[PDB]
Every structure is written in C-alpha cells, then in structure tokens.
C-alpha cells in the first residue's frame, strides 16, 4: 500500500492507483504537485505572515496593560474572540470523515454514530511498520514507556496553579462525551450526542432519564441528608450504577453517568449540578406558574447546557490558556461567519484528554489525607464532610503538571498503559503526523521534543526515529511552554477540538439562541451570567470562595 | 393557552407569561412590536423590493431565449443557482426545532432522531378549536372532504406532461426519507439518516445491508432471469419484505426498502438502481484492481448518492419547475455561503408529498391494461414485460394533475383520508398558518384559494372560515399556476425542503466533495454527468429513450 508512507502533505488525500502507485488529491489544500507540497501564491504570503503559535502564546500571556484596554473595548474583544473561534475550528472537519475502520471516506464512517470519528485516518493494515514506514517492525513495550517516561517519582505541581476543583471539573465535564464502549472496543462510544448534552446528569437514554426524574415541578429525584440535597439511590430510581459490592445500598447514589460513583470528587459535581437543575426549576416555576413538569424540566436542561458552555469557556479554558485576553462565550460572534452547528467526538480528542498527571498522591479533605484505596468509591466521605467542605478543600489543593513527563501517579499506571495500548489497537498515526495535521512543524529530534537530554535519550532508545514516537506518550513528555501546564501540541490540537465542540452546539445556533428558548429573559440571564463561582455560590451551603486555581 | 391564537407574526416565538398573558420573541425576525408585526427599516426596503413568487415563476417560465444565454454563461448560471439554493434554504431551521410533542424548543425534540421534525409547532392541547381558535369546535368529516373535493370523477392529466416514469421515481426516491413508523404513529420515522442515504437500496441497518451484499467486488446480490439482472430473493438473502401470502417464493424480490414489493413500478427502479450499483463496482474495479470488496462497495454507494442528487436536481426538479433556467447540481456554489450540511425530515414535507393524484386509472404496459386489483404486489408483470418494455410504457403514459382537486383515484381514496386524519392527529396548524410560515400572503376567500366556484363553495360548507382550512386538503384544491402541476403553496413550501434535503447531504460538504472521495476523476465524473436518461441507458437493455415528460 503506497499510502503507508503518508506521502500527501497539507491535508492532501492519499489514494492508491494500481498496486505500485498513489495519487494525492490537493483539492482546496492551498498547494499543488505530486504530494501537495508546492504552495500556491496566497499560501506563500500567508505562511510568511503567519507567526508561530508560540509567538502568539507569548503575546497573549504578556502585555497585561494592553489587554486591559482590549478587554474593555467591546468591538475589539468581540472581533478577536470571533477570530479565535473560526480560525481554530477550521482545523476540524465537519461533518466528520474517518473513523477507526475507514481510512477513506465512506457512508458507514459518516453515519454510524457509535464510532468515535478521527482527525487523521488509521494506518493501513498491510504496512511495513505499525505506524506506516517509520520505526521498528514492532513498537516499544507499552509498560516500559509508561515506566521510563510517565510514572511519577516526585509530584510536580501545575505551575499555572490548577486545583482539584479544576481537575475534577475536567473529569466530570469530559465524561459526558468521552464514554468509551469497551463492550465493543476503544473505537466506540456510548455518547451518541457527541457533545455537551449533559447526559452525565440527565442520562443518555430516555429510559434512564425517566428513572432519575421526579416528574413534579420539572425536577430530578433527590435525597435530603443533613439538611442538604443529594442525588437519589439506585434502589429508589432503578437507574443502574457502577459500584463494587462493599458499597451499601443506601450509599449507591444514582446520577446520569454510570461511572460517577468512582470518586467523591465526581459525585460532588454531580450533586452540585443536580442542585443547579432543581434550583433553575424553582426559578422557572415563578416565571411560568402555568407550565407543567415537562416544559419545566426541558427548559431547565437547556439552561444548564448553556451554563456549562459559559463556564467552560470563560472560567475553565480561560484558566488553562493563561491569557490576559478575556475569553467570551457569545454565539452571536459566529452569526456572520461560516460555521457548522454540529459535532462528532474525535478519538484523538479523547486520547489527548487523558490528563491523569493532574492527580495528586493523596486527597486532602479538611484535616484528613485519603489515599486512593480509601478514596475510591467512598461516598461516606462525601456525607462525612459535605459539599461545602469539599469545595473549600479542593480549591486549596494543587493539581499536577500534565506536560513535561514523569508525573503520572503509580495508582493510575495501568490506565496510562491502556491509553497507549488502545492507541495502537485503533491504529493511530505518529505524533509528528498529528503535528503536521494541526499546522505545526514536526520535531526533528528527541532532544527538541523534550527540551532536555534525559528522557529524550530514553525515547531514542525506545523508538529509534523521531517520526516513530506515538501521540499520547509524546504529548505528556513534550516540553512545556514557559511555566505552562501543557506543551505546544496539546494546545494546538486541543483548542480546535474544544472550541468546535462547545460552539458547535445546537443552542448556539441562531434558531435556538434567543430568550424564548429558555423561558424568557430571566432564564436567558442565568446562562449569560453563569460562572464556576456562582454555580458553587448558589448551590453550596455558605457560598464559599472557589476558582480553578489555588489561592 | 393564549398562544392558541398564534399571535406572534414573522417567525416570532410565542410564549406564555402567566395564565392569561403571552409574549412574542421578535429576535432577529426583522420585526418588533407586541406581535412582531412592525417592520424594521431594512425590512421595509426588502419587503417593498421583493417580487411575488408568481411574478418570479412567470419570469422563470418565460423569456426562453434569454435563459438559454444565461445557461451558457457559467458566471451567471452559477450566481443565479447559488442564490436559489441559499434563499430557499434560509426558510428551514437547521439544526431542527419542533416535533409533534414539543411546540417549544427542547433537547428531546432536537436530539431524538425517531421524530419527524416540524416547520410549524403543534397546536397546543387545550386550545378552543383543533387548529387554535378558528373553525368549528370539530373539524369537518375526513371522508366527506375526500369525496366532495379530492376524489377523481374524470382523470385530469398533468399539463406539464409528467409520466409514470416521473411518478414512480417520486415514489421510489422519496420513500428513503419518508418511512412513517406506523407501529408508533404518524409522528415517527424509521429513516434515521434523515435524507438521501439510499437506505432504500442498501438497507437502513448494517444487518439488512449484510444480507443484500455479495461481499465480492463490492457488489449487491442479484439474480439473472431471462439473461437480465434482477434483485435477489427473500429466500436467498433472509432480508424480510412485505409480501402477501399469495406471492410465490421466487417472485419475492428483496431490496433495501421493505415495501418496494408493493408495486412493479417501484421494483423497476430498485432493479435499475441495483444494476447501476454493480455497474459502478465494475467501473471502479478497473480503476482500482487493488481495492477490496469493502472499499469497492462503500465508494460505489457514495457515487450513487451523488448520481441521485444530480438527477433529482437537474432532471426531476428541473422538469417539475418547468423553468427555462437550467438548474445545476454543484456543491461548490455554496462553499462561499453560510449553509448547514445537515437535515431533518419535516412531517409537513412528508404530508405535502402525498401526490397520489399523479396516479392513473389503469396501468398500461406494452399493449396491456392492469387495474389496481392486478397491478399491486404483482412482480410477475415485471418479469413478463421485462424492464425495457416497462420504461418504454411508463415514458409514454401520462400522469394525473396534483393541484386543482378532484383527481385522487378511488383506489387510494382511503390513503387520502389517512393523510388528513394523521395530520389532525399530529396537531397541524392551518393552511393559512403555513403560508405565512413560508412568506406567502394568506388567502382571504375560498374563491381566491381555488380560483373557481364549485369547490370553494364546498369548502365554505365544510370549514366556514378560510383560516380553518387544513394543510393537505388546500394543497390539492389550490388553483394551479398557468398550465402548472402545482399551486404556488406546494412550490414555495416544497422547494425549501427539497433543496435543503439535497444540498444538506454530507457529500456536498467541502471535505467530501472531491475526486479522491469517489475513487478519482472517473468515479467523480459519473456523478457530474448523471441523468435519468443515462441511468436507463446504462442499465436497461436496448437503451430506450426516457424522460419525466411524455413525447
Ligand atoms: C481530564 C481529567 C481526568 C481526571 C481528573 C481523571 C481522574 C481519574 C481518577 C481519580 C481522580 C481515577 C481513579 C481515574 C481512573 C480512570 N480514568 Co480518568 N481521569 C480524567 C480523564 C480520563 C479520560 C479522558 C479517560 C478515557 C475515558 C474513556 O471512556 O475512554 C479516562 C479513563 C479512566 C479509566 C478507564 C480505563 C481505560 O482503560 O479506559 C479509569 C479506571 N479518564 N481517572
Ligand atoms: C410521491 C409519489 C407517490 C406515489 C406515486 C404513491 C403511489 C401509491 C400507490 C399506487 C401506485 C398506492 C397503493 C399507495 C398507497 C400508500 N401511499 Co403512496 N404514493 C406516493 C407518496 C406517498 C408518501 C409521501 C406517503 C407517506 C409515507 C410515510 O412513510 O409516511 C405515502 C403513503 C402511502 C401509504 C401509507 C399507509 C398509511 O399511512 O396508512 C399507502 C397504503 N405514499 N401510494
Ligand atoms: C456501527 O458499526 C458497528 C461495528 O461495525 C456495528 O456493530 C456490529 O453489528 C453487527 C450486526 O448487527 C454485529 O454482527 C453480529 O451480529 C449477529 C449477532 O447475532 C450475527 O449474526 C453476526 O454474525 C455477528 O455476530 C457485530 O458484532 C457488531 N460489532 C460491534 C463491534 O458491535 C453497528 O451495528 C453499526 N451501527 C449501526 C447503527 O448500524
Ligand atoms: C424518542 O422519543 C420516543 C417517543 O417518546 C421514545 O420512545 C419511547 O421510549 C420509551 C422507553 O424509554 C417507551 O416506554 C415504554 O416502555 C417502557 C418499558 O418499561 C414502559 O415503562 C413505558 O411506560 C412505555 O410503555 C415508549 O413507549 C416509547 N414511545 C413510543 C411512542 O415509541 C424514544 O425512546 C426516544 N428515543 C431516545 C433515543 O430516547
Ligand atoms: C498550557 S497553555 O499554553 O497555557 C494553554 C492552555 C490552553 C489553551 C486553550 C485551549 C485548550 C483547551 C483544552 C485543551 C487544550 C487547549 C483553548 O480551547 O483555548 C485556549 C491555550 C494555551
Ligand atoms: C408547479 S410549478 O409552478 O411549475 C413548480 C414546480 C416545481 C418547482 C421547484 C421545486 C419543488 C420540488 C418539489 C416540490 C415542490 C417544489 C424545487 O425544489 O425547485 C423548483 C417550482 C415551481
Ligand atoms: C471511607 O471513608 C470513611 C470516612 O468518612 C472511612 O471511615 C472509611 O475507612 C473509608 N473507606 C475505606 C475503604 O477506607
Ligand atoms: C399478475 O400478472 C399476471 C400476468 O403478468 C396475471 O396473469 C395475473 O392474473 C396477475 N395477478 C392478479 C392477482 O391479477
Ligand atoms: N518551567
Ligand atoms: N391550465
């Protein structure tokens, strides 16, 4: 298969012609030639005028006094934010194309919603090396890579100050569209909404939704424990959950996502978001005393979806970015632009989002340290301390640095190995190939990748060629941007996936984005003034301070 | 419910505020005021410069010599065709909004692909009259409407000269996205692909597809009978079909759509499209002797999807329009525009497509006549005359006129009645309510609606108020345009659905629409040269002349 060497550059589509020849389709790539590497004239100019992503990142993270002005000049802030959205989202094909089973466009790959889609097609099955033509005939031992490049010896804190409120928000949030179906394999998902539908609160299916609902006032079922509201149980709802056998029945809280019984941190946000839904229900009932349970529930869900995107853009990502420019959630920025209001979750999006280095060695709640064995599946901890205590504690506890390597906790070691194994199982192309896919210069050496000599020597001993290095391992050991949590590649591959998935939501389309969709101005206002702090303020006893960084 | 009166105009969203108050959301309607009825300044200009549709239709169906010049100026033909697509598609909300159970925006309505969507929301439940406020407490008798207004008394031929080739094409073509799930109700569909995915050839599910495929050279199973290719049997494939018990085993042909055994006219196109598929497999095997079965199959399917859309626009719809202007299938026309590559079939789209007056009183094949008694479920006729004779006979047989009322054959009388009942059951708004939804002046008198005296008289007896007339009845009794097949409403409501459905397909998106997607330039050329004539010519013995109009 001549396409094994990935001959086609700049998004050129490779296709075999006979047994010994290929043909690059350069249509609308900006280039021409056998391999789509000769630039057209406007491409030459653009490339010449295009500053490096790291130059852009410098400018965005410096000159604070300059961005102060920009931030308070609506026309400017809007124009910039609008550009940020369109430029980044352009790197994601929409509607989607390839998946794990198709390196060529096909109706099965487009239409079958059970697959994660793919940004780059899989490596053909009959290739000399598992990645194409580079590297040894066999790939390095996954456990070896994990042990020599990923495993944590000494905890490395996030220089950006990310706390456990951020870490668990990331886990909780992404697991509504990262829902791998291992019954079928790593290439499949149970998140058929492929985005922010809040199925992790309300359930994936109507059947599960109906189990969780109270069908009174539009609300969700709940328990009252020590004066405060918590989710209902498996027993009361009949909504199944993943709990080991030791968990007593009355401690098996039922929420949208089956897996959120895993850690108390997830069950916290489950509790907080459950509280938020029922709160919005009270609000809406006042606005619409003539409304029944159904419209109250449905409108509340739409409001909470908006809240989610609002918070994720203006608190979650703003924190990650480290920008002085204030990011903005505003569907109006795109109403004059070409933009697809749909999304399909990429398998690589899932892979790069395995930020398990965030995890600490122990969890500190109030005056007590819990190890992993103590902390996993322990809902008594949640009741023992209550949500307020949790917020206050997690806000103070630092999270780990993702990029830079050697910062994955031993407890979640095998998970990190699984992340590698499943990449290979789904035939991922190389790190350098994904770099090129998102308009990044490929790394020419290991030393250039890590910015150091120790891990780069291990990499060289493992892989041989820099073009054989795999996506997930490279992402975690990539040289961090100055005092950053991520390296360049995590950002330039991540931001497009994130922003597309957020703005490519139905509620952001002009037909939906108007006050009547959310039951008037009052409801519409809940979205547009939402924040991580006010979410905690309105739903956590005492209204404690919180943010995604430690004070 | 105060919104029963449908107070909000010009796409304004009506919303209850309290028990006896309402509020219109005039967001981006171009209007303001309590009822969104006062035009904004730019709207004033647009409103006064827009020519009536009948003016536009006159201009498009006259000045023949001028259009033949326009047609041969790529710059002009493109510009025109582009505006046609964008303008007509701006009338369809995308992503979709309402369905039969939700007259307000909700996540259940958007996300649930089992519903038909709705261009207008369902009339609320507790309203004064079924339509809202207008009309009597009870709608007139269904059968009585059918008999006094819709039932044929003497066959009325289509002025534009449409034939059975056209009639069965419409039935065959539209039955891939009109698959009402009557096991659940008229509001639900089985075509979850919601558009032109050719499931009526390949089967809706992978399970069914696998039964129909040969898994050799990407081809579909088939028989050779009398030296010609026919679809395989239920026996040979295990693919269930709707056949009555009388039908012998060997005449139980199995194709994608379970119901196409219903008439020989449908099985005709099934056979032709089946031959086209395996023909393209042959063409692609010569271009790619290295390709395997799976890719040969998938790529052929993508090609046939291209062929269908090509023919529907440039042959099928071009015929229907009677436009001197030569419509063009060219996805590149929209790469500059705001356009959403996605679709959701509207129940109203389904309703208005019940062109059952197209049907003759008898079916003439060669030198024989068959009535509905002996024509239905009789594939023996198909094998008796062969496909070639079928095309020769259908090409020459005139179809009935759809507008003007009183042209439904007694055989499908019940069906016509089923249309009205299922409409009421789904809480459709009035005919005049839909005219306003598609920017038409509502008819003020029954006479203006029918342009005659006897039927309008009959209508005023049944309904009383012109605002009480239902969608389906009016569409078929409406005054046709000059020597036209339809009235203006059918067109100005039909076209937006048609074009959105066609151009919203994935393959029209810029990532798919390139030669590599279709196997190269040869494969790509098959799409861009397709016509109803060449489909017949390539897959039917003797290459008989054919067309959607009688000689
Ligand atoms: C982004 C934040 C984030 C955090 C904070 C987080 C924190 C935690 C944590 C303790 C707090 C524990 C015990 C786990 C344990 C796991 N993680 Co996460 N993980 C997170 C993102 C991921 C993602 C992404 C996946 C892939 C999920 C999937 O469905 O494939 C993952 C998968 C898992 C799996 C499934 C293993 C597999 O083979 O797929 C386990 C077990 N987990 N993780
Ligand atoms: C546009 C062309 C067209 C033609 C030529 C056509 C010609 C014929 C014909 C003889 C030639 C017969 C016996 C039928 C008989 C039927 N038609 Co059509 N119909 C057509 C468009 C429709 C559409 C559209 C529907 C709605 C189908 C759905 O799935 O909801 C329809 C539904 C039906 C149903 C559904 C049954 C029910 O809802 O109770 C029957 C029976 N049929 N029709
Ligand atoms: C999306 O693609 C999925 C994977 O290709 C597909 O799942 C596959 O479905 C087939 C047929 O339904 C299964 O085949 C099995 O089915 C019966 C079981 O009784 C047997 O007769 C077969 O021989 C075979 O055992 C596959 O097992 C299944 N594969 C996986 C990984 O789940 C989905 O159906 C596709 N989605 C849609 C909507 O079509
Ligand atoms: C899309 O909307 C459909 C209409 O609401 C919905 O179909 C409905 O699905 C539920 C299952 O959640 C069915 O429930 C029936 O069966 C259970 C079995 O225990 C009973 O408890 C229920 O009382 C009820 O009898 C509904 O009957 C069914 N309705 C129809 C008209 O088919 C789909 O499930 C929705 N799709 C998705 C993906 O959620
Ligand atoms: C580590 S950094 O260089 O400070 C940095 C961090 C985040 C971003 C940004 C992301 C992003 C979000 C999720 C994953 C990856 C990136 C985004 O959508 O906008 C900016 C940009 C830069
Ligand atoms: C009856 S007529 O006035 O000659 C006429 C016929 C067809 C059209 C046209 C339709 C159409 C197709 C199916 C249903 C309804 C409209 C279209 O998509 O473009 C033109 C426009 C006008
Ligand atoms: C769960 O937490 C409680 C404290 O609230 C503790 O007593 C118990 O030991 C924990 N469970 C395990 C298995 O350590
Ligand atoms: C079916 O057609 C054949 C001729 O092709 C005819 O002899 C037969 O009677 C028809 N069936 C019915 C039920 O009329
Ligand atoms: N650093
Ligand atoms: N006429």
UniProtKB/Swiss-Prot annotation, chains A, B:
E.C. code: 1.14.99.1
Gene3D superfamilies: Haem peroxidase domain superfamily, animal type, Laminin
Residues with the O-acetylserine modification: 547
Top-level taxon of origin: Eukaryota
Any single GO CC term annotated in Swiss-Prot or TrEMBL for this entry: cytoplasm
Keyword Iron part of the UniProt annotation: yes
Activity modulation comment: The cyclooxygenase activity is inhibited by nonsteroidal anti-inflammatory drugs (NSAIDs) including aspirin, ibuprofen, flurbiprofen, celecoxib, flufenamic, mefenamic and tolfenamic acids as well as by hydroperoxide scavenger erythrocyte glutathione peroxidase GPX1. Aspirin triggers enzyme acetylation turning off its ability to generate pro-inflammatory prostaglandins, but switches on its capacity to produce anti-inflammatory lipid mediators involved in inflammation resolution.
UniProt enzyme class: oxidoreductase
Topology within the bilayer: Peripheral membrane protein
Residue(s) at site: Aspirin-acetylated serine: 498
Outcome after substituting residue 498 to T: Decreased enzyme activity with arachidonic acid. Loss of cyclooxygenase activity
A GO term, aspect molecular function: protein homodimerization activity
Intrachain disulfide bonds: 3-14, 4-127, 8-24, 26-36, 537-543
InterPro entries listed in its UniProt record: EGF-like_dom, Haem_peroxidase_animal, Haem_peroxidase_sf, Haem_peroxidase_sf_animal, Oxylipin_biosynth_metab
Catalysed reactions listed for this entry: (5Z,8Z,11Z,14Z)-eicosatetraenoate + AH2 + 2 O2 = prostaglandin H2 + A + H2O; (5Z,8Z,11Z,14Z)-eicosatetraenoate + 2 O2 = prostaglandin G2; prostaglandin G2 + AH2 = prostaglandin H2 + A + H2O; (5Z,8Z,11Z,14Z,17Z)-eicosapentaenoate + 2 O2 = prostaglandin G3
Sorted UniProt keywords: Acetylation, Dioxygenase, Disulfide bond, Endoplasmic reticulum, Fatty acid biosynthesis, Fatty acid metabolism, Glycoprotein, Heme, Iron, Lipid biosynthesis, Lipid metabolism, Membrane, Metal-binding, Microsome, Nucleus, Oxidoreductase, Peroxidase, Prostaglandin biosynthesis, Prostaglandin metabolism, S-nitrosylation, Signal
Associated pathway: Lipid metabolism; prostaglandin biosynthesis
Post-translational changes noted in the entry: S-nitrosylation by NOS2 (iNOS) activates enzyme activity. S-nitrosylation may take place on different Cys residues in addition to Cys-508. Acetylated at Ser-547 by SPHK1. During neuroinflammation, acetylation by SPHK1 promotes neuronal secretion of specialized preresolving mediators (SPMs), especially 15-R-lipoxin A4, which results in an increase of phagocytic microglia.
Domain EGF-like: 1-37
Obligatory cofactor(s): heme b
Cofactor note: Binds 1 heme b (iron(II)-protoporphyrin IX) group per subunit.
Family stated for the protein in its record: Belongs to the prostaglandin G/H synthase family.
Subunit structure as annotated in this protein's UniProt entry: Homodimer.
Note: The conversion of arachidonate to prostaglandin H2 is a 2 step reaction: a cyclooxygenase (COX) reaction which converts arachidonate to prostaglandin G2 (PGG2) and a peroxidase reaction in which PGG2 is reduced to prostaglandin H2 (PGH2). The cyclooxygenase reaction occurs in a hydrophobic channel in the core of the enzyme. The peroxidase reaction occurs at a heme-containing active site located near the protein surface. The nonsteroidal anti-inflammatory drugs (NSAIDs) binding site corresponds to the cyclooxygenase active site. Conversion of arachidonate to prostaglandin H2 is mediated by 2 different isozymes: the constitutive PTGS1 and the inducible PTGS2. PTGS1 is expressed constitutively and generally produces prostanoids acutely in response to hormonal stimuli to fine-tune physiological processes requiring instantaneous, continuous regulation (e.g. hemostasis). PTGS2 is inducible and typically produces prostanoids that mediate responses to physiological stresses such as infection and inflammation.
Protein name listed in UniProt: Prostaglandin G/H synthase 2
Organism, as annotated: Homo sapiens
Gene: PTGS2
